[PDB]
Structures are given as structure tokens and as C-alpha cells.
């Protein structure tokens, strides 16, 4: 029904919000050599997935880390330097985060139009019978 | 429901763990412009039939007043 559109579009609104927050944590950790949890932060990605289970909502199935190797930088005098003297920094790519930032915002706003479009159809469907 | 025959949108990204040998991730063949047009066409056509159905009831109600 038209109410299923609200569930489908609403799921995308939450879905694009997850990717926006993941990108925000990527931009804020692009230069963080250290990290609690004994893990040099690596770029995270939200992998969307259609939950077919007509109406196909979108669900986040889990956040996946980047496969790119960490950026090694020779800083011998740093306390975190290894024997060779290289400290490692996250593999966050700025350009893809900016592209993800644009795409997530554009996709978020176009889901609002569909919810608005379905809202008007239900209101007119209610005016029938009056 | 029938799936579109448009080829999938290929993107070069040898970083996504779900990529392939050549670092390509295939994405759905969804065109935003055609989805916006369908949204406009579906909403307007849906509400047009509301008017016809609503006006059809009025004709039925007037028929009951025949001879009165």
C-alpha cells in the first residue's frame, strides 16, 4: 500500500544516516595514529543491502572496514614507532568521503520527496467518502 | 514485477571488500531521472482516478433521487 512507501522510504532515511555518521567518523580519524582498543582505526564503510523479504526495504547489514593498506610514515622518534621507525596511519581517503558525503545527502533528500508524494495520495484517498 | 534490462552500473573501487578481480563493484541500474518522472506520473494518475471514483458515486446518488 501507500503506507509501505513510508516504511521503505523511512528505511532509506535511516540507511543514509548510518553512512553519513560512518563518513563523519572517517573524516575525524584520518590523522589519528593512536586509538583505544589497540587497533589503528581503518576506514569504515556502510554496505547497504536489499532485504527482499513490490516493496523492497534497504537495510544496513553491518559496517565493513577498508581493505587498503595503512599509510606507513617514517617517524623514528615517536613512542609508537616500530624497530624500523615507521608509524602507521588510517587509510582514510578524503576524496571518497567527500563523494560519499554528497551522495548520502542527495539520496537522503530524494527519499523525502517520495514520502511527501505518498502522503498527498493518502490524503486524497481519504477525501473520497466525504 | 519485471526487472529492468539496463546493464548494471560498473564502478572501479579496488577498496571495497566485496569487489572483484579488476576492482569493480557493480551497482543497481537505477536512473534517478526516470524514478522522479514515475513518481510524478504515478501520483497524478492515482489522484485522477480518485476524482472519477468520487464523481461516480455522485451519479449513483442522483439516480436514487429519480422521480422525487
Amino acid at each position: 500500500s501507500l503506507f509501505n512507501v513510508f516504511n521503505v522510504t523511512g528505511s532509506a532515511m535511516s540507511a543514509e544516516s548510518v553512512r553519513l555518521n560512518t563518513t563523519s567518523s572517517n573524516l575525524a580519524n584520518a590523522d589519528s595514529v593512536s586509538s583505544s582498543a589497540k587497533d589503528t582505526y581503518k576506514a569504515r564503510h556502510a554496505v547497504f543491502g536489499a532485504e527482499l523479504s513490490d516493496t523492497v526495504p534497504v537495510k544496513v547489514m553491518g559496517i565493513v572496514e577498508s581493505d587498503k593498506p595503512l599509510s606507513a610514515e617514517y617517524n623514528p622518534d615517536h613512542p609508537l614507532a616500530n624497530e624500523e621507525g615507521y608509524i602507521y596511519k588510517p587509510n582514510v581517503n578524503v576524496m571518497e568521503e567527500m563523494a560519499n558525503m554528497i551522495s548520502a545527502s542527495r539520496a537522503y533528500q530524494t527519499n523525502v520527496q517520495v514520502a511527501d508524494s505518498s502522503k498527498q495520495m493518502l490524503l486524497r484517498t481519504l477525501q473520497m467518502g466525504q | 514485477i519485471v526487472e529492468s534490462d539496463k546493464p548494471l552500473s560498473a564502478e572501479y573501487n579496488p577498496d571495497h571488500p566485496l569487489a572483484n578481480e579488476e576492482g569493480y563493484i557493480y551497482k543497481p541500474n537505477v536512473n534517478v531521472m526516470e524514478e522522479m518522472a514515475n513518481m510524478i506520473s504515478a501520483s497524478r494518475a492515482y489522484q485522477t482516478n480518485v476524482q472519477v471514483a468520487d464523481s461516480s458515486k455522485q451519479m449513483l446518488l442522483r439516480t436514487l433521487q429519480m422521480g422525487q
Binding site: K38, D39, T40, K42, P69, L70, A72, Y88 | -
Partner: protein, 180 residues
């Protein structure tokens, strides 16, 4: 090919965790020592080197790992989800849980001790070893197990998950509850 000393350096973080995800490495040098966690997920590695030492946890989810040789020291947990391991060797010093879900595992060492949780979910294992001791939660859901040994020890909850147990241990002390 095989991982070298210089190739090892390019897959290590600041605190010393080796990341080999999707990397085309087939075998690791013997007497290998890792400062932190080890990740060999989705790797074509079929065998772990003898004398392997991991300062953190071993991650081999959805990998091709098949054989682990005895004497391996793992400080953290062992996660072999979706791998090709068929048997668990005797004498593995495991400092954490052992997750063997969705593996072709068939045999387990006798009187095995798991300092954390144990998973045999959806495994073709036919029977648990005698004298098994589990300090955490035991999940046997979807597996082929239907008879427990004479004596076993589980300090947490026991989850049947759907499989039918007919012969319960004679000597069993449970710190939690049993769930179907």
C-alpha cells in the same frame, strides 16, 4: 607466493596487528610472532606455521584455513568462522573463546578446555569429547550433535538451538540454564 619480512611490515598497524584480508599469501614463515591481533580472513592460506605465536586474537573468518599445528600460542580468542578447518589439534594454548561456526569440523581434542565461549553451530561434528570444560556459553544449534558425553562442564548457558539431545551427561554442574 609467501609473506616476507618487508611484506609483513606493510600490513601492520601502530600497536602491532597483522592485517592480511584478501591478500594473496599462501604460507607464513615458521616461528611467526605477532605483537597483536592476527587477521587471515578470506586468505588462500591452508596451513598455519609451526611455532606460530599471536599476541592478540586470530581472525580467520570466511578463509581457506584448514590445518593448525600444535604448539600455537594465542593470547586472545580464535575466530575460525566459515573456514575449512576439519579437526582441532591437541595442545593449543587459547586465551579466549573458540568460534567454529559453519566449519567442516568433525573431531575435537579430548578434555578440551575453552576459557571463553564455544561454538559448533551448523557443524558436522557427531559427538563431543569426554571431559569437555566450557567456561562460557555453549552453542550447538543446527549441528549434528545428539548425544553428550558421560561428563562435561559448562559454566554458562547451554543452547540447543534446535538439535535434539537424548543422552545427557551423568555428571553435569551448570552455572546457567538450558535453552532449546
Amino acid at each position: 607466493y609467501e609473506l616476507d619480512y618487508y611484506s609483513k611490515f606493510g600490513h601492520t598497524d601502530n600497536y602491532g596487528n597483522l592485517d592480511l584480508r584478501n591478500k594473496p599469501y599462501t604460507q607464513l614463515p615458521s616461528g611467526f610472532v605477532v605483537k597483536g591481533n592476527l587477521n587471515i580472513s578470506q586468505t588462500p592460506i591452508k596451513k598455519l606455521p609451526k611455532g606460530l605465536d599471536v599476541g592478540g586474537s586470530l581472525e580467520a573468518t570466511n578463509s581457506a584455513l584448514k590445518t593448525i599445528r600444535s604448539g600455537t600460542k594465542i593470547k586472545g580468542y580464535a575466530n575460525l568462522l566459515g573456514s575449512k578447518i576439519e579437526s582441532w589439534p591437541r595442545g593449543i594454548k587459547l586465551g579466549g573463546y573458540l568460534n567454529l561456526t559453519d566449519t567442516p569440523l568433525k573431531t575435537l581434542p579430548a578434555k578440551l578446555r575453552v576459557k571463553g565461549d564455544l561454538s559448533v553451530i551448523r557443524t558436522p561434528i557427531s559427538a563431543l569429547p569426554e571431559g569437555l570444560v566450557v567456561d562460557g556459553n555453549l552453542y550447538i544449534g543446527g549441528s549434528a550433535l545428539q548425544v553428550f558425553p558421560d561428563t562435561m562442564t559448562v559454566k554458562g548457558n547451554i543452547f540447543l538451538g534446535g538439535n535434539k539431545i537424548t543422552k545427557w551427561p551423568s555428571n553435569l554442574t551448570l552455572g546457567g540454564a538450558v535453552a532449546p
